[PDB]
């Protein structure tokens, strides 16, 4: 049966499902780990359809054993899958393994046109970066350009077996597109680049002329920039 590799406290799974605000007619897309037990919790809610995207073929077999007519299992990679091939309005949820969390979140953003809401459990550090208050990163800016990031709760290691070495957190992404970025791949190129060598003053990474035009101190560093700064820089560099 389930819980073969990971056990998560049921209270935590229930809170995660509650954050999704599942209502009649909703389509939910579940990604990440411990899908057996999370799936059972999600199916207690009035969703219309639940897709589970899972690479583990033994787990696929076990999930398929669940009778519910609303459940459909897709044996593909959630860090690469085009979510918008599943439907026009999807709520995405998952406990994300450390080594694919950032990819899955990035992929969710590429699919933002059909993802109004996502709830993820990730390492506390990843969550704090995404929130953008205590820390930041290229993915944080990429995400927050298109979503509001809500830090829901901290999850100490004890709520997992085996426990992780660091605390986890639940975050909620709510679609909110703040800037009209058309080419997401190109925007990512810009953000990844400007975040390389995070300690380097910006004048070593962006021509001073453009920094002054954007009203940015040439001796500022990338982690002190606002979203508005990133967009205006992006536009200045694209128009050059």
JSON list of C-alpha atoms in Angstrom, two decimals:
[
{"chain": "A", "resi": 1, "resn": "UNK", "atom": "CA", "xyz": [0.00, 0.00, 0.00]},
{"chain": "A", "resi": 2, "resn": "UNK", "atom": "CA", "xyz": [1.00, 3.62, 0.65]},
{"chain": "A", "resi": 3, "resn": "UNK", "atom": "CA", "xyz": [3.53, 5.39, 2.87]},
{"chain": "A", "resi": 4, "resn": "UNK", "atom": "CA", "xyz": [6.22, 3.01, 1.61]},
{"chain": "A", "resi": 5, "resn": "UNK", "atom": "CA", "xyz": [8.97, 5.65, 1.41]},
{"chain": "A", "resi": 6, "resn": "UNK", "atom": "CA", "xyz": [7.71, 8.72, 3.25]},
{"chain": "A", "resi": 7, "resn": "UNK", "atom": "CA", "xyz": [5.25, 9.39, 6.05]},
{"chain": "A", "resi": 8, "resn": "UNK", "atom": "CA", "xyz": [3.85, 12.87, 6.61]},
{"chain": "A", "resi": 9, "resn": "UNK", "atom": "CA", "xyz": [1.70, 13.81, 9.60]},
{"chain": "A", "resi": 10, "resn": "UNK", "atom": "CA", "xyz": [-1.96, 13.69, 8.54]},
{"chain": "A", "resi": 11, "resn": "UNK", "atom": "CA", "xyz": [-2.62, 17.08, 10.12]},
{"chain": "A", "resi": 12, "resn": "UNK", "atom": "CA", "xyz": [-0.08, 18.63, 7.78]},
{"chain": "A", "resi": 13, "resn": "UNK", "atom": "CA", "xyz": [-1.62, 17.02, 4.70]},
{"chain": "A", "resi": 14, "resn": "UNK", "atom": "CA", "xyz": [-5.08, 18.18, 5.79]},
{"chain": "A", "resi": 15, "resn": "UNK", "atom": "CA", "xyz": [-3.86, 21.76, 6.20]},
{"chain": "A", "resi": 16, "resn": "UNK", "atom": "CA", "xyz": [-2.29, 21.62, 2.76]},
{"chain": "A", "resi": 17, "resn": "UNK", "atom": "CA", "xyz": [-5.57, 20.43, 1.24]},
{"chain": "A", "resi": 18, "resn": "UNK", "atom": "CA", "xyz": [-7.46, 23.13, 3.17]},
{"chain": "A", "resi": 19, "resn": "UNK", "atom": "CA", "xyz": [-5.21, 25.85, 1.71]},
{"chain": "A", "resi": 20, "resn": "UNK", "atom": "CA", "xyz": [-6.31, 24.79, -1.78]},
{"chain": "A", "resi": 21, "resn": "UNK", "atom": "CA", "xyz": [-9.87, 25.87, -1.00]},
{"chain": "A", "resi": 22, "resn": "UNK", "atom": "CA", "xyz": [-11.27, 22.97, -3.01]},
{"chain": "A", "resi": 23, "resn": "UNK", "atom": "CA", "xyz": [-14.76, 23.61, -4.32]},
{"chain": "A", "resi": 24, "resn": "UNK", "atom": "CA", "xyz": [-17.27, 21.91, -6.61]},
{"chain": "A", "resi": 25, "resn": "UNK", "atom": "CA", "xyz": [-16.01, 21.69, -10.18]},
{"chain": "A", "resi": 26, "resn": "UNK", "atom": "CA", "xyz": [-12.32, 22.20, -9.30]},
{"chain": "A", "resi": 27, "resn": "UNK", "atom": "CA", "xyz": [-9.56, 20.36, -11.11]},
{"chain": "A", "resi": 28, "resn": "UNK", "atom": "CA", "xyz": [-6.56, 19.59, -8.96]},
{"chain": "A", "resi": 29, "resn": "UNK", "atom": "CA", "xyz": [-3.08, 18.53, -10.15]},
{"chain": "A", "resi": 30, "resn": "UNK", "atom": "CA", "xyz": [-0.96, 16.74, -7.56]},
{"chain": "A", "resi": 31, "resn": "UNK", "atom": "CA", "xyz": [2.82, 16.56, -7.98]},
{"chain": "A", "resi": 32, "resn": "UNK", "atom": "CA", "xyz": [5.81, 15.61, -5.80]},
{"chain": "A", "resi": 33, "resn": "UNK", "atom": "CA", "xyz": [6.19, 12.92, -3.14]},
{"chain": "A", "resi": 34, "resn": "UNK", "atom": "CA", "xyz": [4.06, 10.82, -0.80]},
{"chain": "A", "resi": 35, "resn": "UNK", "atom": "CA", "xyz": [1.29, 10.91, -3.39]},
{"chain": "A", "resi": 36, "resn": "UNK", "atom": "CA", "xyz": [-0.51, 7.88, -1.97]},
{"chain": "A", "resi": 37, "resn": "UNK", "atom": "CA", "xyz": [-1.51, 9.47, 1.33]},
{"chain": "A", "resi": 38, "resn": "UNK", "atom": "CA", "xyz": [-1.95, 12.99, -0.03]},
{"chain": "A", "resi": 39, "resn": "UNK", "atom": "CA", "xyz": [-4.20, 11.63, -2.77]},
{"chain": "A", "resi": 40, "resn": "UNK", "atom": "CA", "xyz": [-6.47, 10.02, -0.17]},
{"chain": "A", "resi": 41, "resn": "UNK", "atom": "CA", "xyz": [-6.74, 13.33, 1.68]},
{"chain": "A", "resi": 42, "resn": "UNK", "atom": "CA", "xyz": [-7.49, 15.32, -1.49]},
{"chain": "A", "resi": 43, "resn": "UNK", "atom": "CA", "xyz": [-10.24, 12.92, -2.53]},
{"chain": "A", "resi": 44, "resn": "UNK", "atom": "CA", "xyz": [-12.11, 13.77, 0.68]},
{"chain": "A", "resi": 45, "resn": "UNK", "atom": "CA", "xyz": [-12.81, 17.16, -0.95]},
{"chain": "A", "resi": 46, "resn": "UNK", "atom": "CA", "xyz": [-15.45, 18.04, -3.59]},
{"chain": "A", "resi": 47, "resn": "UNK", "atom": "CA", "xyz": [-13.02, 18.22, -6.55]},
{"chain": "A", "resi": 48, "resn": "UNK", "atom": "CA", "xyz": [-14.27, 17.23, -10.01]},
{"chain": "A", "resi": 49, "resn": "UNK", "atom": "CA", "xyz": [-11.02, 15.73, -11.23]},
{"chain": "A", "resi": 50, "resn": "UNK", "atom": "CA", "xyz": [-7.66, 14.91, -9.62]},
{"chain": "A", "resi": 51, "resn": "UNK", "atom": "CA", "xyz": [-4.60, 14.36, -11.79]},
{"chain": "A", "resi": 52, "resn": "UNK", "atom": "CA", "xyz": [-1.57, 12.84, -10.10]},
{"chain": "A", "resi": 53, "resn": "UNK", "atom": "CA", "xyz": [1.72, 13.28, -11.97]},
{"chain": "A", "resi": 54, "resn": "UNK", "atom": "CA", "xyz": [4.08, 10.53, -10.81]},
{"chain": "A", "resi": 55, "resn": "UNK", "atom": "CA", "xyz": [7.19, 8.93, -12.35]},
{"chain": "A", "resi": 56, "resn": "UNK", "atom": "CA", "xyz": [7.41, 5.96, -9.93]},
{"chain": "A", "resi": 57, "resn": "UNK", "atom": "CA", "xyz": [5.68, 3.10, -11.78]},
{"chain": "A", "resi": 58, "resn": "UNK", "atom": "CA", "xyz": [5.17, 1.03, -8.64]},
{"chain": "A", "resi": 59, "resn": "UNK", "atom": "CA", "xyz": [3.41, 4.04, -7.10]},
{"chain": "A", "resi": 60, "resn": "UNK", "atom": "CA", "xyz": [1.37, 4.45, -10.29]},
{"chain": "A", "resi": 61, "resn": "UNK", "atom": "CA", "xyz": [0.21, 0.85, -9.90]},
{"chain": "A", "resi": 62, "resn": "UNK", "atom": "CA", "xyz": [-0.75, 1.41, -6.24]},
{"chain": "A", "resi": 63, "resn": "UNK", "atom": "CA", "xyz": [-2.62, 4.67, -6.97]},
{"chain": "A", "resi": 64, "resn": "UNK", "atom": "CA", "xyz": [-4.59, 3.06, -9.77]},
{"chain": "A", "resi": 65, "resn": "UNK", "atom": "CA", "xyz": [-5.92, 0.68, -7.12]},
{"chain": "A", "resi": 66, "resn": "UNK", "atom": "CA", "xyz": [-7.95, 3.57, -5.70]},
{"chain": "A", "resi": 67, "resn": "UNK", "atom": "CA", "xyz": [-11.49, 3.21, -6.98]},
{"chain": "A", "resi": 68, "resn": "UNK", "atom": "CA", "xyz": [-12.41, 6.88, -7.27]},
{"chain": "A", "resi": 69, "resn": "UNK", "atom": "CA", "xyz": [-13.61, 7.75, -10.80]},
{"chain": "A", "resi": 70, "resn": "UNK", "atom": "CA", "xyz": [-12.20, 11.28, -10.33]},
{"chain": "A", "resi": 71, "resn": "UNK", "atom": "CA", "xyz": [-8.60, 10.12, -10.13]},
{"chain": "A", "resi": 72, "resn": "UNK", "atom": "CA", "xyz": [-6.33, 9.99, -13.17]},
{"chain": "A", "resi": 73, "resn": "UNK", "atom": "CA", "xyz": [-2.63, 9.13, -12.96]},
{"chain": "A", "resi": 74, "resn": "UNK", "atom": "CA", "xyz": [-0.13, 10.54, -15.43]},
{"chain": "A", "resi": 75, "resn": "UNK", "atom": "CA", "xyz": [3.24, 8.81, -15.57]},
{"chain": "A", "resi": 76, "resn": "UNK", "atom": "CA", "xyz": [5.36, 11.82, -16.50]},
{"chain": "A", "resi": 77, "resn": "UNK", "atom": "CA", "xyz": [7.81, 14.34, -15.01]},
{"chain": "A", "resi": 78, "resn": "UNK", "atom": "CA", "xyz": [6.13, 17.24, -13.21]},
{"chain": "A", "resi": 79, "resn": "UNK", "atom": "CA", "xyz": [9.19, 19.44, -13.70]},
{"chain": "A", "resi": 80, "resn": "UNK", "atom": "CA", "xyz": [8.69, 19.25, -17.48]},
{"chain": "A", "resi": 81, "resn": "UNK", "atom": "CA", "xyz": [5.02, 18.48, -18.04]},
{"chain": "A", "resi": 82, "resn": "UNK", "atom": "CA", "xyz": [2.74, 21.05, -19.75]},
{"chain": "A", "resi": 83, "resn": "UNK", "atom": "CA", "xyz": [0.09, 21.43, -17.07]},
{"chain": "A", "resi": 84, "resn": "UNK", "atom": "CA", "xyz": [-2.11, 23.46, -19.42]},
{"chain": "A", "resi": 85, "resn": "UNK", "atom": "CA", "xyz": [-2.71, 20.34, -21.53]},
{"chain": "A", "resi": 86, "resn": "UNK", "atom": "CA", "xyz": [-4.85, 19.08, -18.62]},
{"chain": "A", "resi": 87, "resn": "UNK", "atom": "CA", "xyz": [-7.29, 21.95, -18.40]},
{"chain": "A", "resi": 88, "resn": "UNK", "atom": "CA", "xyz": [-7.84, 25.70, -18.44]},
{"chain": "A", "resi": 89, "resn": "UNK", "atom": "CA", "xyz": [-8.02, 26.16, -14.68]},
{"chain": "A", "resi": 90, "resn": "UNK", "atom": "CA", "xyz": [-5.92, 23.99, -12.38]},
{"chain": "A", "resi": 91, "resn": "UNK", "atom": "CA", "xyz": [-5.03, 24.03, -8.72]},
{"chain": "A", "resi": 92, "resn": "UNK", "atom": "CA", "xyz": [-1.54, 22.59, -8.28]},
{"chain": "A", "resi": 93, "resn": "UNK", "atom": "CA", "xyz": [-0.38, 20.94, -5.05]},
{"chain": "A", "resi": 94, "resn": "UNK", "atom": "CA", "xyz": [2.56, 18.93, -3.82]},
{"chain": "A", "resi": 95, "resn": "UNK", "atom": "CA", "xyz": [5.22, 18.04, -1.28]},
{"chain": "A", "resi": 96, "resn": "UNK", "atom": "CA", "xyz": [8.28, 18.69, -3.40]},
{"chain": "A", "resi": 97, "resn": "UNK", "atom": "CA", "xyz": [11.50, 16.66, -3.14]},
{"chain": "A", "resi": 98, "resn": "UNK", "atom": "CA", "xyz": [14.52, 18.89, -2.51]},
{"chain": "A", "resi": 99, "resn": "UNK", "atom": "CA", "xyz": [16.24, 18.16, -5.83]},
{"chain": "A", "resi": 100, "resn": "UNK", "atom": "CA", "xyz": [13.31, 19.02, -8.10]},
{"chain": "A", "resi": 101, "resn": "UNK", "atom": "CA", "xyz": [11.43, 21.65, -6.05]},
{"chain": "A", "resi": 102, "resn": "UNK", "atom": "CA", "xyz": [12.82, 24.64, -7.95]},
{"chain": "A", "resi": 103, "resn": "UNK", "atom": "CA", "xyz": [12.22, 23.01, -11.34]},
{"chain": "A", "resi": 104, "resn": "UNK", "atom": "CA", "xyz": [8.62, 22.10, -10.50]},
{"chain": "A", "resi": 105, "resn": "UNK", "atom": "CA", "xyz": [7.94, 25.63, -9.26]},
{"chain": "A", "resi": 106, "resn": "UNK", "atom": "CA", "xyz": [9.55, 27.11, -12.38]},
{"chain": "A", "resi": 107, "resn": "UNK", "atom": "CA", "xyz": [7.43, 24.81, -14.56]},
{"chain": "A", "resi": 108, "resn": "UNK", "atom": "CA", "xyz": [4.30, 25.92, -12.72]},
{"chain": "A", "resi": 109, "resn": "UNK", "atom": "CA", "xyz": [5.12, 29.53, -13.65]},
{"chain": "A", "resi": 110, "resn": "UNK", "atom": "CA", "xyz": [5.52, 28.60, -17.32]},
{"chain": "A", "resi": 111, "resn": "UNK", "atom": "CA", "xyz": [1.97, 27.26, -17.00]},
{"chain": "A", "resi": 112, "resn": "UNK", "atom": "CA", "xyz": [0.61, 30.31, -15.16]},
{"chain": "A", "resi": 113, "resn": "UNK", "atom": "CA", "xyz": [-2.16, 30.91, -17.71]},
{"chain": "A", "resi": 114, "resn": "UNK", "atom": "CA", "xyz": [-3.95, 27.84, -16.37]},
{"chain": "A", "resi": 115, "resn": "UNK", "atom": "CA", "xyz": [-2.75, 27.84, -12.74]},
{"chain": "A", "resi": 116, "resn": "UNK", "atom": "CA", "xyz": [-4.55, 30.41, -10.54]},
{"chain": "A", "resi": 117, "resn": "UNK", "atom": "CA", "xyz": [-3.41, 28.76, -7.32]},
{"chain": "A", "resi": 118, "resn": "UNK", "atom": "CA", "xyz": [-0.69, 26.44, -6.09]},
{"chain": "A", "resi": 119, "resn": "UNK", "atom": "CA", "xyz": [0.18, 25.07, -2.66]},
{"chain": "A", "resi": 120, "resn": "UNK", "atom": "CA", "xyz": [3.63, 23.56, -2.12]},
{"chain": "A", "resi": 121, "resn": "UNK", "atom": "CA", "xyz": [5.58, 22.10, 0.75]},
{"chain": "A", "resi": 122, "resn": "UNK", "atom": "CA", "xyz": [9.28, 22.85, 0.33]},
{"chain": "A", "resi": 123, "resn": "UNK", "atom": "CA", "xyz": [12.42, 23.36, 2.42]},
{"chain": "A", "resi": 124, "resn": "UNK", "atom": "CA", "xyz": [12.06, 26.38, 4.71]},
{"chain": "A", "resi": 125, "resn": "UNK", "atom": "CA", "xyz": [14.96, 28.11, 2.97]},
{"chain": "A", "resi": 126, "resn": "UNK", "atom": "CA", "xyz": [13.34, 27.75, -0.47]},
{"chain": "A", "resi": 127, "resn": "UNK", "atom": "CA", "xyz": [10.08, 29.09, 0.97]},
{"chain": "A", "resi": 128, "resn": "UNK", "atom": "CA", "xyz": [11.79, 32.08, 2.59]},
{"chain": "A", "resi": 129, "resn": "UNK", "atom": "CA", "xyz": [13.55, 32.95, -0.67]},
{"chain": "A", "resi": 130, "resn": "UNK", "atom": "CA", "xyz": [10.26, 32.70, -2.57]},
{"chain": "A", "resi": 131, "resn": "UNK", "atom": "CA", "xyz": [8.54, 35.00, -0.09]},
{"chain": "A", "resi": 132, "resn": "UNK", "atom": "CA", "xyz": [11.31, 37.50, -0.78]},
{"chain": "A", "resi": 133, "resn": "UNK", "atom": "CA", "xyz": [11.46, 39.20, 2.64]},
{"chain": "A", "resi": 134, "resn": "UNK", "atom": "CA", "xyz": [14.23, 37.38, 4.52]},
{"chain": "A", "resi": 135, "resn": "UNK", "atom": "CA", "xyz": [15.97, 36.26, 1.35]},
{"chain": "A", "resi": 136, "resn": "UNK", "atom": "CA", "xyz": [15.57, 36.09, -2.42]},
{"chain": "A", "resi": 137, "resn": "UNK", "atom": "CA", "xyz": [16.89, 34.59, -5.65]},
{"chain": "A", "resi": 138, "resn": "UNK", "atom": "CA", "xyz": [16.19, 34.45, -9.38]},
{"chain": "A", "resi": 139, "resn": "UNK", "atom": "CA", "xyz": [13.32, 31.98, -8.86]},
{"chain": "A", "resi": 140, "resn": "UNK", "atom": "CA", "xyz": [11.76, 34.20, -6.19]},
{"chain": "A", "resi": 141, "resn": "UNK", "atom": "CA", "xyz": [11.66, 37.16, -8.59]},
{"chain": "A", "resi": 142, "resn": "UNK", "atom": "CA", "xyz": [10.45, 34.97, -11.49]},
{"chain": "A", "resi": 143, "resn": "UNK", "atom": "CA", "xyz": [7.61, 33.61, -9.32]},
{"chain": "A", "resi": 144, "resn": "UNK", "atom": "CA", "xyz": [6.64, 36.91, -7.70]},
{"chain": "A", "resi": 145, "resn": "UNK", "atom": "CA", "xyz": [6.39, 38.66, -11.06]},
{"chain": "A", "resi": 146, "resn": "UNK", "atom": "CA", "xyz": [3.34, 36.45, -11.66]},
{"chain": "A", "resi": 147, "resn": "UNK", "atom": "CA", "xyz": [2.19, 35.24, -8.21]},
{"chain": "A", "resi": 148, "resn": "UNK", "atom": "CA", "xyz": [1.72, 36.49, -4.69]},
{"chain": "A", "resi": 149, "resn": "UNK", "atom": "CA", "xyz": [3.59, 34.24, -2.27]},
{"chain": "A", "resi": 150, "resn": "UNK", "atom": "CA", "xyz": [2.01, 33.48, 1.08]},
{"chain": "A", "resi": 151, "resn": "UNK", "atom": "CA", "xyz": [4.04, 31.75, 3.81]},
{"chain": "A", "resi": 152, "resn": "UNK", "atom": "CA", "xyz": [1.45, 29.51, 5.44]},
{"chain": "A", "resi": 153, "resn": "UNK", "atom": "CA", "xyz": [3.28, 27.59, 8.14]},
{"chain": "A", "resi": 154, "resn": "UNK", "atom": "CA", "xyz": [6.58, 26.11, 9.24]},
{"chain": "A", "resi": 155, "resn": "UNK", "atom": "CA", "xyz": [6.82, 22.31, 9.37]},
{"chain": "A", "resi": 156, "resn": "UNK", "atom": "CA", "xyz": [9.48, 20.93, 11.73]},
{"chain": "A", "resi": 157, "resn": "UNK", "atom": "CA", "xyz": [11.34, 17.75, 10.71]},
{"chain": "A", "resi": 158, "resn": "UNK", "atom": "CA", "xyz": [9.38, 15.63, 13.23]},
{"chain": "A", "resi": 159, "resn": "UNK", "atom": "CA", "xyz": [6.26, 15.78, 11.07]},
{"chain": "A", "resi": 160, "resn": "UNK", "atom": "CA", "xyz": [8.11, 13.57, 8.56]},
{"chain": "A", "resi": 161, "resn": "UNK", "atom": "CA", "xyz": [9.57, 10.10, 8.63]},
{"chain": "A", "resi": 162, "resn": "UNK", "atom": "CA", "xyz": [12.33, 10.04, 7.72]},
{"chain": "A", "resi": 163, "resn": "UNK", "atom": "CA", "xyz": [12.82, 13.58, 9.05]},
{"chain": "A", "resi": 164, "resn": "UNK", "atom": "CA", "xyz": [14.58, 16.04, 6.73]},
{"chain": "A", "resi": 165, "resn": "UNK", "atom": "CA", "xyz": [17.78, 17.68, 8.01]},
{"chain": "A", "resi": 166, "resn": "UNK", "atom": "CA", "xyz": [16.15, 21.12, 7.80]},
{"chain": "A", "resi": 167, "resn": "UNK", "atom": "CA", "xyz": [12.71, 22.56, 8.54]},
{"chain": "A", "resi": 168, "resn": "UNK", "atom": "CA", "xyz": [10.10, 22.65, 5.79]},
{"chain": "A", "resi": 169, "resn": "UNK", "atom": "CA", "xyz": [7.33, 25.14, 5.05]},
{"chain": "A", "resi": 170, "resn": "UNK", "atom": "CA", "xyz": [4.03, 25.34, 3.25]},
{"chain": "A", "resi": 171, "resn": "UNK", "atom": "CA", "xyz": [3.61, 28.17, 0.77]},
{"chain": "A", "resi": 172, "resn": "UNK", "atom": "CA", "xyz": [0.62, 29.32, -1.25]},
{"chain": "A", "resi": 173, "resn": "UNK", "atom": "CA", "xyz": [0.98, 30.94, -4.65]},
{"chain": "A", "resi": 174, "resn": "UNK", "atom": "CA", "xyz": [-1.92, 33.07, -5.83]},
{"chain": "A", "resi": 175, "resn": "UNK", "atom": "CA", "xyz": [-1.82, 34.27, -9.40]},
{"chain": "A", "resi": 176, "resn": "UNK", "atom": "CA", "xyz": [-1.20, 38.01, -9.62]},
{"chain": "A", "resi": 177, "resn": "UNK", "atom": "CA", "xyz": [0.59, 39.16, -12.76]},
{"chain": "A", "resi": 178, "resn": "UNK", "atom": "CA", "xyz": [2.34, 42.40, -11.89]},
{"chain": "A", "resi": 179, "resn": "UNK", "atom": "CA", "xyz": [4.26, 43.02, -15.12]},
{"chain": "A", "resi": 180, "resn": "UNK", "atom": "CA", "xyz": [3.46, 42.13, -18.75]},
{"chain": "A", "resi": 181, "resn": "UNK", "atom": "CA", "xyz": [6.36, 39.79, -19.49]},
{"chain": "A", "resi": 182, "resn": "UNK", "atom": "CA", "xyz": [5.71, 38.07, -22.81]},
{"chain": "A", "resi": 183, "resn": "UNK", "atom": "CA", "xyz": [8.79, 35.89, -23.25]},
{"chain": "A", "resi": 184, "resn": "UNK", "atom": "CA", "xyz": [9.19, 33.94, -20.01]},
{"chain": "A", "resi": 185, "resn": "UNK", "atom": "CA", "xyz": [12.29, 32.10, -21.23]},
{"chain": "A", "resi": 186, "resn": "UNK", "atom": "CA", "xyz": [13.99, 35.39, -22.07]},
{"chain": "A", "resi": 187, "resn": "UNK", "atom": "CA", "xyz": [12.99, 36.88, -18.73]},
{"chain": "A", "resi": 188, "resn": "UNK", "atom": "CA", "xyz": [14.46, 33.85, -16.99]},
{"chain": "A", "resi": 189, "resn": "UNK", "atom": "CA", "xyz": [17.72, 34.36, -18.95]},
{"chain": "A", "resi": 190, "resn": "UNK", "atom": "CA", "xyz": [17.90, 37.91, -17.64]},
{"chain": "A", "resi": 191, "resn": "UNK", "atom": "CA", "xyz": [17.10, 36.97, -14.02]},
{"chain": "A", "resi": 192, "resn": "UNK", "atom": "CA", "xyz": [19.47, 34.01, -13.91]},
{"chain": "A", "resi": 193, "resn": "UNK", "atom": "CA", "xyz": [22.24, 36.18, -15.33]},
{"chain": "A", "resi": 194, "resn": "UNK", "atom": "CA", "xyz": [21.76, 39.14, -12.97]},
{"chain": "A", "resi": 195, "resn": "UNK", "atom": "CA", "xyz": [21.71, 36.76, -9.98]},
{"chain": "A", "resi": 196, "resn": "UNK", "atom": "CA", "xyz": [25.04, 35.13, -10.94]},
{"chain": "A", "resi": 197, "resn": "UNK", "atom": "CA", "xyz": [27.76, 36.25, -8.52]},
{"chain": "A", "resi": 198, "resn": "UNK", "atom": "CA", "xyz": [25.27, 37.66, -6.03]},
{"chain": "A", "resi": 199, "resn": "UNK", "atom": "CA", "xyz": [27.92, 39.53, -4.02]},
{"chain": "A", "resi": 200, "resn": "UNK", "atom": "CA", "xyz": [29.18, 41.53, -7.01]},
{"chain": "A", "resi": 201, "resn": "UNK", "atom": "CA", "xyz": [28.11, 45.18, -7.21]},
{"chain": "A", "resi": 202, "resn": "UNK", "atom": "CA", "xyz": [25.61, 45.73, -10.00]},
{"chain": "A", "resi": 203, "resn": "UNK", "atom": "CA", "xyz": [27.84, 48.03, -12.06]},
{"chain": "A", "resi": 204, "resn": "UNK", "atom": "CA", "xyz": [30.02, 44.97, -12.76]},
{"chain": "A", "resi": 205, "resn": "UNK", "atom": "CA", "xyz": [26.99, 43.10, -14.13]},
{"chain": "A", "resi": 206, "resn": "UNK", "atom": "CA", "xyz": [24.90, 45.82, -15.80]},
{"chain": "A", "resi": 207, "resn": "UNK", "atom": "CA", "xyz": [26.30, 48.85, -17.62]},
{"chain": "A", "resi": 208, "resn": "UNK", "atom": "CA", "xyz": [26.23, 51.86, -15.25]},
{"chain": "A", "resi": 209, "resn": "UNK", "atom": "CA", "xyz": [24.35, 53.89, -17.88]},
{"chain": "A", "resi": 210, "resn": "UNK", "atom": "CA", "xyz": [21.33, 51.56, -17.61]},
{"chain": "A", "resi": 211, "resn": "UNK", "atom": "CA", "xyz": [21.48, 51.41, -13.79]},
{"chain": "A", "resi": 212, "resn": "UNK", "atom": "CA", "xyz": [21.37, 55.21, -13.54]},
{"chain": "A", "resi": 213, "resn": "UNK", "atom": "CA", "xyz": [18.46, 55.35, -15.97]},
{"chain": "A", "resi": 214, "resn": "UNK", "atom": "CA", "xyz": [16.59, 52.86, -13.77]},
{"chain": "A", "resi": 215, "resn": "UNK", "atom": "CA", "xyz": [17.42, 54.96, -10.71]},
{"chain": "A", "resi": 216, "resn": "UNK", "atom": "CA", "xyz": [19.56, 52.21, -9.21]},
{"chain": "A", "resi": 217, "resn": "UNK", "atom": "CA", "xyz": [22.74, 52.82, -7.23]},
{"chain": "A", "resi": 218, "resn": "UNK", "atom": "CA", "xyz": [25.59, 51.32, -9.31]},
{"chain": "A", "resi": 219, "resn": "UNK", "atom": "CA", "xyz": [27.07, 50.00, -6.05]},
{"chain": "A", "resi": 220, "resn": "UNK", "atom": "CA", "xyz": [23.87, 48.26, -4.97]},
{"chain": "A", "resi": 221, "resn": "UNK", "atom": "CA", "xyz": [23.72, 44.46, -5.11]},
{"chain": "A", "resi": 222, "resn": "UNK", "atom": "CA", "xyz": [21.09, 42.29, -6.78]},
{"chain": "A", "resi": 223, "resn": "UNK", "atom": "CA", "xyz": [19.39, 41.12, -3.56]},
{"chain": "A", "resi": 224, "resn": "UNK", "atom": "CA", "xyz": [18.39, 44.72, -2.72]},
{"chain": "A", "resi": 225, "resn": "UNK", "atom": "CA", "xyz": [16.47, 45.33, -5.96]},
{"chain": "A", "resi": 226, "resn": "UNK", "atom": "CA", "xyz": [12.67, 45.59, -6.01]},
{"chain": "A", "resi": 227, "resn": "UNK", "atom": "CA", "xyz": [10.40, 43.79, -8.48]},
{"chain": "A", "resi": 228, "resn": "UNK", "atom": "CA", "xyz": [9.85, 47.12, -10.23]},
{"chain": "A", "resi": 229, "resn": "UNK", "atom": "CA", "xyz": [13.64, 47.46, -10.61]},
{"chain": "A", "resi": 230, "resn": "UNK", "atom": "CA", "xyz": [13.90, 44.07, -12.30]},
{"chain": "A", "resi": 231, "resn": "UNK", "atom": "CA", "xyz": [11.17, 44.85, -14.78]},
{"chain": "A", "resi": 232, "resn": "UNK", "atom": "CA", "xyz": [12.47, 48.29, -15.69]},
{"chain": "A", "resi": 233, "resn": "UNK", "atom": "CA", "xyz": [16.00, 46.91, -16.10]},
{"chain": "A", "resi": 234, "resn": "UNK", "atom": "CA", "xyz": [14.66, 44.03, -18.17]},
{"chain": "A", "resi": 235, "resn": "UNK", "atom": "CA", "xyz": [12.90, 46.49, -20.47]},
{"chain": "A", "resi": 236, "resn": "UNK", "atom": "CA", "xyz": [15.93, 48.78, -20.71]},
{"chain": "A", "resi": 237, "resn": "UNK", "atom": "CA", "xyz": [18.17, 45.89, -21.65]},
{"chain": "A", "resi": 238, "resn": "UNK", "atom": "CA", "xyz": [15.66, 44.49, -24.16]},
{"chain": "A", "resi": 239, "resn": "UNK", "atom": "CA", "xyz": [15.24, 47.88, -25.84]},
{"chain": "A", "resi": 240, "resn": "UNK", "atom": "CA", "xyz": [19.01, 48.26, -26.25]}
]
